[PDB]
């Protein structure tokens, strides 16, 4: 029943090998957020019937919707978080400028997260030594 759409988000990501970033699933995200809205509304009225009608027999259904709300949220955050972990890898694998084909699969907010990460990293590396610190995104392999 509930949370099936959320699982689509998770599966899509888990099937993408080597940190590949599939297209941001805007529709999936929207539909899950909409399911949570509905679930919250139905529980609000039921918790009311159980407050003004002696319907303690609705509690089971109430917890049911509540567990589904926490599940939808868990999948949402896990999905979005994992994507950030792959986007972070993009900085180290492709550099400061991302290929447009890679940027195409990112959400506007993700590009923002990327730029902030890019800046924090640049700042950190610049603080290591005297002149321009040290670019630790270089020298990934020991001397030949």
């Amino acid at each position: 029943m509930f949370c099936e759409k959320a699982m689509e988000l998770i599966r899509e990501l888990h099937r993408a090998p080597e940190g590949q970033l599939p297209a941001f699933n805007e529709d999936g995200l929207r539909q899950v957020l909409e399911e949570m809205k509905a679930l919250y509304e139905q529980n609000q009225s039921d918790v009311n019937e159980a407050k003004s009608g002696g319907r303690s027999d609705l509690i089971p259904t109430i917890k049911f919707r509540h567990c589904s709300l926490l599940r939808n949220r868990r999948c949402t955050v896990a999905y979005l978080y994992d994507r950030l972990l792959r986007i972070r890898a993009l900085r180290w694998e492709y550099g400061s400028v991302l290929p447009n084909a890679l940027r195409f699969h990112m959400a506007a907010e993700e590009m923002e997260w990327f730029n902030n990460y890019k800046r924090s990293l640049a700042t950190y590396m610049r603080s290591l030594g005297g002149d321009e610190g040290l670019d630790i995104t270089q020298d990934m392999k020991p001397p030949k």
């Binding site: 080597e18 027999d57 972070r88």
Partner: protein, 186 residues
């Protein structure tokens, strides 16, 4: 990028322990798998998924996460049933030769799901736990031999029978051996 595997820190699984990892994609896929349950009370306005309520004592197959949520030591809302794969019959069969079982077909998260199954305080918890451990110990060698190509055997048939966690372990053994061999070449 092939070497992008190092810069990508996926959240690992925690299902083998007390609780699963909140952000673990694998645990989320694991806790989606169905579990046999019997309602101990009616659930109004939900029969549509199985006051348009759901009769009590109904036999249902619910995903592990929902079953966990509605469960409590008492049979208040649900009474949980152990999947056949974790009952005495199958664990005795596993006991004869852990390597003969296809943990992908009976899994794919055999260890993870079985570990989280312990949250329903079943009388057989101690037996379930011991069984998961002995099963792993009994297939460990086969996994190390194959992943490290000790006998030059094709690993395809073995990988197909490994559960998700075993596949990960296999991959690690293969990676370490492969890395050494390539270093050995060029």
């Amino acid at each position: 990028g092939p070497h992008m595997s190092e810069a990508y820190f996926r959240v690992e699984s925690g299902a083998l322990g007390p609780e699963e990892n909140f952000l673990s994609l694998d645990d989320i896929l694991m806790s989606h798998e169905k579990l046999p349950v019997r309602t101990e009370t009616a659930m109004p306005r939900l029969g549509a998924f199985f006051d348009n309520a759901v009769p009590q004592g109904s036999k249902l197959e619910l995903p592990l996460w929902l079953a966990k949520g509605l469960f409590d030591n008492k049979r208040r809302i649900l009474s949980v049933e152990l999947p056949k794969i974790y009952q005495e019959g199958w664990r005795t069969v596993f006991s004869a030769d852990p390597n003969v079982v296809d943990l992908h077909k009976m899994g794919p998260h055999f260890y993870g799901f079985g570990s989280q199954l312990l949250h329903f305080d079943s009388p057989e918890n101690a037996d379930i736990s011991q069984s998961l451990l002995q099963t792993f110990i009994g297939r460990f060698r086969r996994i190390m031999d194959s992943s490290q190509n000790a006998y030059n055997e094709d690993t395809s048939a073995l990988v197909a029978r490994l559960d998700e966690m075993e596949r990960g372990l296999f991959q690690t053994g293969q990676k370490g051996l492969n890395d050494f061999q390539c270093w050995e070449k060029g």
